[PDB]
Amino acid sequence: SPYGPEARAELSSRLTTLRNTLAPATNDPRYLQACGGEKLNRFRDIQCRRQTAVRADLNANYIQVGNTRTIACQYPLQSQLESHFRMLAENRTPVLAVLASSSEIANQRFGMPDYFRQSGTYGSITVESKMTQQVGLGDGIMADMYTLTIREAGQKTISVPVVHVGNWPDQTAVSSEVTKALASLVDQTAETKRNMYESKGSSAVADDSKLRPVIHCRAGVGRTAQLIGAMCMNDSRNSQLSVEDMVSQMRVQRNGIMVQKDEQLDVLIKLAEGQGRPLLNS
């Protein structure tokens, strides 16, 4: 069977080898390095690829698996928020999906500022937050949506649609049913907002580096990877893109950690099986 133990064992073997090769070496020329005395990485083991980095001071990467373009990043550090907000604005972000739980954000030691559920000032940037709808995703998991309005004198005011899942603990994987519903809500949200910029003849519709959905959890490698992988399968243009392709492309474009827990890769495998999508290549 294309989804039998033998196939699953082979896929893991290839993935394992890749993760070891992409392991960040001290002062690795493939990863972004902290220039100066400013902390860049939230974790010394979760690094950001250099050739796909969005900004030099943020741990974020441009990711494209198949025809699906997104942006994965770590939960911004306190001192990166200003730069984080400019990135969202400039990108004309059609949707921001936050997969970090409320419990993690509340934990003051985790250093994860609640920058989207409350209004505030960060440097030259002014952010206003407003709660909109709440969508049930199944298994009791809920999606809380907000609208972030980013204002900066001299720049055009940009509002961003936010989808926050607060009850998805780290190092865990939600059911494939939930993941499929969450992937749909994010595309719909992005699709609606993107439509707006097109009706306004925005200059971002022509730039492949903009109008990309931004997604992140805590490290931006576990929960973020699961959603992205699910979003690719939603795209009707990724026909024949295998599970091997997806994970490979994510790791080579961010870091070999993308899709941390096996339980997470299992959800992707399950969704692929439901689509008759190949696991391995050739």
């Binding site: 509002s159 707006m196 910029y197």
Partner: peptide, 6 residues
């Protein structure tokens, strides 16, 4: 203008 995207 400044808020033509709101």
């Amino acid at each position: 203008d400044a808020d033509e995207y709101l």
